[PDB]
Write a protein that binds this DNA or RNA. Structure first.
Lengths: 176, 176
DNA sequence: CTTGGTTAATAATTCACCAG
DNA sequence: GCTGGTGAATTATTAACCAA
């Protein structure tokens, strides 16, 4: 334990981080905010996934990132840290507790919408197209190759997904 | 106890409420949604109160009531009763008289004139605000067709200084 | 006092989903 | 090609604090 406590703080990664997150702090709070939200949104990552790991208040965080309501250093610092980490965390997850709910990214949405002008009930196969069409796209966004889209992981597209997405779509419209 | 149970089901008032709501369910679903959205809108009742008292899924109600997504009968029936009761409920406490506590909600009225009095004086001093407490408060009473007297019936959604207070401030604070 | 941070609550939306 | 009903999670937004 304290021996891992330390055995953590010391790697070249650890340091690399302690210090990137350090300039983030010296720099403009907001310009940082963008970046991240940037980030988050490139990879589609639940805001929740961040409160959870950082323990910052979720409304506090939503605003300082969507609105720049100022966050006191200590906190920021946490949040930056999160992000720098997850940036490797996210990194290996390719090149190399709660289980996140999937989300349509706008990219896949784009297709889906386009593809859907009078597509009530797609053929369990036409579906399949688009599954494989989406992720191909979703990788474009995150700056890798279609080759393996398995890193998308939590937000990996599937049948049943577009499935419902039709389906729900065909209810959506269905009223007003 | 079953004697209460019975003595309850069996009132002049009560009984007729069954009738009213029973007719309501013969009507166009969305016409009642309309009705009620409105009614609540008027008295400013939390969507959440309904959700407890009735015990319907909170999203389902936001739909069936905004989107007008279809809700099976029973649930409806459970709504109309609600709405129904409430109505006497609201008007006892109101018209004639002298596990968790709702929460305040500013109403367009109160709000309108708030945003006027605003681009007019960034920081109202107690007297100042105080005026407004009686402005809204009256206006709130118009809305629900009653007397500026005993705007005391507004109850929760009753306006106050400190309440007006923070309504500046998160009006002030919010221009960053 | 008042800002300045920070918050618990509400509710529109989003995704899933099972029983006819 | 299940398909209407519903429902848990999510996150922008609201209305209040408490610390200095």
């Amino acid at each position: 334990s304290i021996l891992k406590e330390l055995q953590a703080l010391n790697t070249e990664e650890a340091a690399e981080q302690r210090a990137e997150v350090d300039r983030m702090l010296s720099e403009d709070p907001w310009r940082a905010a963008k970046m991240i939200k940037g980030y988050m949104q490139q990879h589609n990552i639940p805001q929740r996934e961040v409160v959870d790991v950082t323990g910052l208040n979720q409304s506090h965080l939503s605003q300082h990132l969507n609105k720049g309501t100022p966050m006191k250093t200590q906190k920021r610092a946490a949040l930056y840290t999160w992000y720098v980490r997850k940036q490797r965390e996210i990194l290996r997850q390719f090149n190399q507790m709660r289980r996140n709910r999937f989300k349509w990214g706008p990219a896949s949405q784009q297709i889906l919408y386009q593809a859907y002008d009078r597509q009530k009930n797609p053929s369990k196969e036409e579906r399949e197209a688009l599954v494989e069409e989406c992720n191909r796209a979703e990788c474009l966004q995150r700056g890798v190759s279609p080759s393996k889209a398995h890193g998308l992981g939590s937000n990996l597209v599937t049948e049943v997904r577009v499935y419902n997405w039709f389906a729900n779509r065909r209810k959506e419209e269905a009223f007003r």
